[PDB]
């Protein structure tokens, strides 16, 4: 079902500081490649990666802008895949952003 991933918005690189069971089987990375990573995920990128959708991706997570992307994305297979990453902000009553909830959804597979 449902593939997402929490960040550390507390910190430079936005550590990934969770992630689920969907989303390492979707990329195909385990959850111990995946901890303590840029949760903007670089280790999906690849040829046809738009670097127009990955700074908007980036951008989302520095405003703490809740934003949608598409983004094509590579498995570890190198399987590609269109993905639609919701970047979602999550701030508290100060209004100051103390996580990220990046949700992954397989939009085609090509």
């Known amino acids: 079902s449902r593939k997402f991933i929490i960040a ?4 430079e690189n936005c ?12 990329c195909g990375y385990s959850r111990a490649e995946v901890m303590q990573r840029p ?5 999906l990128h690849g040829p046809c990666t738009q670097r127009r959708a990955a ?3 980036a951008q989302a ?9 598409e983004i094509a994305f590579y498995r570890k297979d190198g399987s590609c895949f269109l993905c639609l990453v919701d970047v979602v902000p999550v701030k508290n009553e100060d209004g100051a952003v103390i996580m990220f909830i990046l949700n992954f959804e397989v939009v085609m597979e090509k």
């Not at 550590?15 to 979707?26: K, P, Q, R, W």
């Not at 997570?61 to 992307?69: D, F, H, N, T």
């Open 8 to 11: 550390n918005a507390r910190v």
């Open 15 to 26: 550590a990934v500081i969770y992630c689920n069971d969907g989303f390492c089987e979707l």
């Open 39 to 43: 949760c903007t995920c670089d280790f």
């Open 55 to 57: 700074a908007q991706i």
């Open 61 to 69: 997570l520095l405003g703490a802008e809740e934003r949608k992307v």
